[PDB]
Structure formats: structure tokens, C-alpha cells
Amino acid sequence: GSMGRQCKVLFDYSPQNEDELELIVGDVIDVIEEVEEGWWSGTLNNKLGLFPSNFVKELE
Incomplete structure (x- = not known):
């Protein structure tokens, strides 16, 4: 419930x-x-996975 925005x-x-x-x-x-802070959960097209919020920014 963070109203999270997409990360590029x-x-x-x-x-x-x-x-x-x-x-x-x-x-x-x-x-x-x-x-878990660094590890976000989202999906890119058809693969769902965990990704570190270091290489991606919620700047959009």
C-alpha cells in the first residue's frame, strides 16, 4: 500500500x-x-521477479 510508481x-x-x-x-x-527494501517485486512483460532498487529508480 505504498501507491508505488513504476520504476525505469x-x-x-x-x-x-x-x-x-x-x-x-x-x-x-x-x-x-x-x-525487502532493495528487493522489489514486479513484472517485466511476462516474467515476474525480484529486482534490486539500486539499478531501477521510481522516477516516473
């Missing part, structure tokens, strides 16, 4: 696990809610 991918993230969402630079990820 600014930096490259090569995931350590496939549970980690592949951050493609330039695209935007629709986040549901953040679960």
Missing part, C-alpha cells in the same frame, strides 16, 4: 538467480510493492 531500468543487472528479474536498460518495470 537505468542500470544493467545481470541476475545471480533467475528469480531475480532481468533488468533491461531502458525499459520500465511495473512494480507491485516492495518487499
Whole structure:
């Protein structure tokens, strides 16, 4: 319930696990809610995953 806004991918993230969402630079990820500070939960097109809020900013 943070009224979270979509975060655009600014930096490259090569995931350590496939549970980690592949951050493609330039695209935007629709986040549901953040679960553990760094690790947010959202889906990029058809893959749902966890992504670190370091490489993505809620600037939109």
C-alpha cells in the first residue's frame, strides 16, 4: 500500500538467480510493492521477479 510508481531500468543487472528479474536498460518495470527494501517485486512483460532498487529508480 505504498501507491508505488513504476520504476525505469537505468542500470544493467545481470541476475545471480533467475528469480531475480532481468533488468533491461531502458525499459520500465511495473512494480507491485516492495518487499525487502532493495528487493522489489514486479513484472517485466511476462516474467515476474525480484529486482534490486539500486539499478531501477521510481522516477516516473
